[model samples]
Target: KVHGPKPTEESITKPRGPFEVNRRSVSRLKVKGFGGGTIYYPTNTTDGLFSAVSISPGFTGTQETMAWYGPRLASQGFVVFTIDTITTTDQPDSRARQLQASLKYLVNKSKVKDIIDPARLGVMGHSMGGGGSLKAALDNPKLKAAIPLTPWHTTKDFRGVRTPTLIIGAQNDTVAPVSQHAEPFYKSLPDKPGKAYLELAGASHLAPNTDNTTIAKFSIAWLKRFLDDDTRYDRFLCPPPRNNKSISDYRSTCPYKEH
Candidate 1:
């Protein structure tokens, strides 16, 4: 059930080059009761792209929520991949396994060359999905950067994650407590080159993605810095404003020090 802006009739009718557009089901580790996920690729594609794996919230979410961030990234020359968790119970092991399988499929089956640096991949999720995102990144060495929005903290130790990571939290989220999920996880990351935390004031658990402005401005900028290796976008990741009052007023926040 994936859909994007239709390719031009000219592009679809004539195959002038090696690249072609098509949709297919990507076979991966299948969950016992749940079916496998599908992969959507654009027609006449280019190379050197970035990838994004998105996990949805708890019981009441859909793939569309993850898709919301897809176009935003795709427009920036990124090939965003969204994963639909089977019956989001927030199970860390299952989520991690699925992510690993998907990564393998992306590299082996899709043959999406340069979609990810293999050394600089990124992962992101919301709410329960956020928790899963953190777990997967911690488990997979390929994941160089991670963004867990309003994550639910489990007993899992993230100390092993040496990858540069960013954990985004909301001050008013009850489903995923900031103090328990975000603060502790940020502290647990092994001392590394890039690691930080952001807490958006006046925002509830849903603020991260629900607020269009923040998503367009902050999330996209953060990905650009790491995925494109563009320093110009660093300002969005670590803004100059740090006053508690100013920080809390926005729909997002970053507690990590900016270099």
Candidate 2:
């Protein structure tokens, strides 16, 4: 329920922010180890409890392809779990169910339970996984936040969504074109607080998962502000895209601005 006061300068351009935390213990599982899912989180966390997030790959995507974000987000005080699907091209609805299941597995059965705050959970995904993230949030309203990167759903309207959401789109992506996917989805989201859209200039559909710096910057910022209730990220989350070279378009609803 806590978004922020207003958008600011530091919040817009900074990456690898101050909120990055530490953890000695790490929890991880893979398809080889436990069928087809893997998670990373800090162990022996003495600083404080960390928030948790579940991520799913694009259609036909494997956990190995998305193994990058889990450890990265874990280092920043959140448990990150990446999952592989039963097949190469799982539909969005089915992927959404699996995505939710991954979070439950992390909370109820994973070893990092004590270190994670169940109430501060979040979800995100790429492509179909992106659509699944939105659907997962729609089905589970208690989720604190959600981010869907270049999401693609057969239906454009998921108005049931209440979780604070961030939708990332790419300018050159034909897979989930901006006109059909990201823009309309952002418009369909319920108006309350914590909603943002970022369109990358000339980025492909894979840019979000690929090591795009802007994606990491705002993704972490959005989670910190909404999931952890840390307002320090407010400045970054509220501002429109500043560095215009790479960012094609940016839209966010904040204290002083609403769009």
Candidate 3:
């Protein structure tokens, strides 16, 4: 059920905020135009209108792999979607198209469309999904924010990533390599948008899927800060390091260009 202190609360204890997450499988339904997708929302509360999160999984990874964001973000007041690709091993570019389509599905066709705020949205994923998350942001400049976990991309060209983004890298991620994927991607974003790079110590490529308290804390903070435009999370981000600790290094740049 809905558990956890909200952003307005002093103690941020639980992951499930004030709403219980429910699952919606679009596969069973006959949708048209955009594409079939899955949706997760909080059943405990009736939000009439809600912010949305669209997530993509890594190469051949199931929704269950990156499913953690669903219940958590849903509880925290967001409509989270863990999308399935048309093909198992889709390229980063192709996956970006699918992710954008999923966003469209949630905004128009999904059962909760009436309550979905297409403008206030974010994207996230792990590994290949992480890379796809970046590509998706590059494709959807209007996206509010992004979180990519230990992303693996063929090229680290993120010059088009203007969205406030968070890049989570695992120290031991030979699959993606912080030196190549996370580091450069973070540097590519514009200097003004709020951005952060979290290096999980000794963690592998699947570190974001590890379900640790630290990972959840920052992910939630970033989305809350950027997607929800809640300045209460400013202190939680920023401020930076690297190594074998839970969060060895944390670097962030807030969009304070405006007062």
Candidate 4:
């Protein structure tokens, strides 16, 4: 069932979501299977179990590079884990495995586990970690959603992943260019109701590293729609809002299948 306040276009796009967030650190020394990172979750316990999302950073990056997503997503009513890889140089495949491992840690062992609904979960990442988001979804087909920001991966065939995905592209990204990474990755998906590609106008590969309303807005919408099955977000996704000035391009199998 869906949760959170009734969403309005302006309200949903605001700096924070309906809930206030609190965070806890997950130490790498205390965890296995993945490098530990930060866990951000809504402070309210009255709302019932919330869907959770685990995020990973690209090659050579740490959880600090992806920290902005912590409160941003958690405040929106999802338990968010921004993780570091066991090694900063880990490839997409390794990052994917780590992403999955972090999810297990999030729901089973984290102090905030009591507030999470294990069945409803999502994943996100930047660059190679974004590529790992795709691979993680492929490996764990039951994941509710995946958001890969300026993702890079050597393998382009994702015909097997059934998870709903939102691939964010940067118009000026030299590394992992949309043409070579994000676009083809989106194009390779199964073309279902839950798939979408959003390219940021005048943005770069590091766009997700900081706070951007465009990324935050649609990402919250995608995660809410898929993870929580919240239809209140449909207006933002359906009929294709191709007119937004901030979006370089947008594509999706509109009228996302009914929950």
Candidate 5:
């Protein structure tokens, strides 16, 4: 079931200006393994600059599933939002609706004009959430990019996608086999300029999101390349050789192969 932290009086006020927080608005729902969600804004101002959307896992997952990556992205000047989908595991369509609702809430009700850049928005998900995220991205034409971690399944028609995308898969994950979920999706993409697939060596479905060091380095670089448009970010997108065997070996996979 969904459990939330204690609510305070301050949670009730409508956030002021562009990036303000709506205090005491915390809400939760009952789901099996996963809990609830918390939506966060950058605090003050509205210009529709940069925003992030994240979907949490199914069964035993919470909004915290994406918390590890939110603050880091926020530090780089992004307004990050995440949702909990464990309770709706049996209803993928409903989960997509919930995600769409959250997006609308942030863009309309929150009056976050600055953070909701229609052209720069990105979405990400893990496990069941990853699958939901892909669906959500397909539903929302405004999304500029998508990142799915160990996605549980693939959609048949990626032809509708106009946004750049990054699909990350684990070599050792049986729960969501990469060969089935990630590889085929990568291949389905029409030859495009900004599509990429990353297969983490020796990494299981959980490794990509759990390892602090790897997440910090890889995510930061990925965002920089896609969101910030820094050419230097290319190095991280495809790191160069190093003395360490693992490092060099890892770098060898840079400029990841297509399909």
Candidate 6:
């Protein structure tokens, strides 16, 4: 079921959302396929089945680098899994496999499985992990949404990806410049409403790892629009919100084509 309180400039843009958050650790010792990390969820059970998103850290990065996402996104009424890689140097394709593994663990064996709607799942990541989010989406079209932040991938062609996607790029990113990585990834997506690209103004490749509200706000909107099938958040997405000073550029086939 669709969840959360109404979205407003005041509420959606805030650092935290309506529901209080709770978290649990998934130790690598107890899991297989991927290095385990943390799972964050809303404290309120009345919200019903929360859509879940499994996130991965970029190459040579640990879950701690993406730690801020767990509580932050979970409080918004979604189950957020911020995971680590089997090794710090795992490639995007490896991370993609691990991303799927993390979700499998979350839905089948995690402690909060009861609160999650298995069918309404998504994926996200930074750098290689961001690229992994794309590969994960491509490998698993059943994914409701994907947000690849300043993603770095060896393969540029993602024409077959049908999952709704939102690619967040850093305007000044040298590691995976928008022109080559983010822009091409967005263009390659199926020309449909549930696709978008939001470039952060004066940001860097490391932008998604920090406490950036633009990333948080839009990520929440896209996830809500697709995974939860919640349209109240649509206003922030459609029309692309060009006036925001934080965004350097925004593109979308809005009037967002839906499932």
> Per-residue lDDT for 173 in model 6?
100
lDDT of 1 by residue, 6-122 (tens): 333232222121233344453325433222454444443544444444334433555555655554554444455666666656365556655555556565545564444454457
Clashing residue pairs, candidate 1? 21-43, 198-253, 198-254, 199-253, 200-252, 200-253
lDDT of 2 by residue, 70-177 (tens): 655665557787777667588888888878877777777676778778899998989998998999999999998899988988879978898899999999999999
TM, every model? 0.72, 0.85, 0.89, 0.98, 0.70, 0.98
RMSD of each: 8.1, 4.4, 3.3, 1.0, 9.8, 1.0
* Deviating ranges (above 4 Å) for candidate 5: 1-26, 29-36, 41-48, 86-94, 111-114, 154-157, 208-211, 228-232, 238-259
| Residue-level lDDT for 188 in candidate 6 | 92
The alpha-carbon deviation from the true structure for residue 195 of candidate 6, after best TM-score superposition, in angstroms, is 0.7
Query: Which pairs clash (backbone N, Cα, C closer than 3 Å) in model 2?
Result: 11-236, 25-43, 60-88
Instruction: Report the C-alpha lDDT of model 6 over 60-157, residue by residue, as the tens digit.
Output: 89999999988778988999999988999999999999999999999999999898999999999999999999999999999999999999998998
Off by over 4 Å in 6: none
How does candidate 1 score on lDDT? 0.57
Q: Please, what is the whole-model Cα lDDT of each candidate in the order they appear? A: 0.57, 0.76, 0.76, 0.91, 0.55, 0.91
Off by over 4 Å in 1: 1-44, 51-60, 111-117, 209-211, 239-246, 249-259
The better candidate by TM-score, 1 or 5, is 1
Lowest summed lDDT window (length 10), candidate 1:
9-18
How many steric overlaps does candidate 6 have? 1
Clashing pairs in 4: none
**lDDT value, candidate 4, whole model:** 0.91
Q: Sum up the clashes in candidate 3.
A: 1
Stronger candidate by lDDT (1 vs 2): 2
Worst 10 residues of 3 by lDDT: 1-10
Model 1, residue 87: C-alpha shift (Å): 2.9
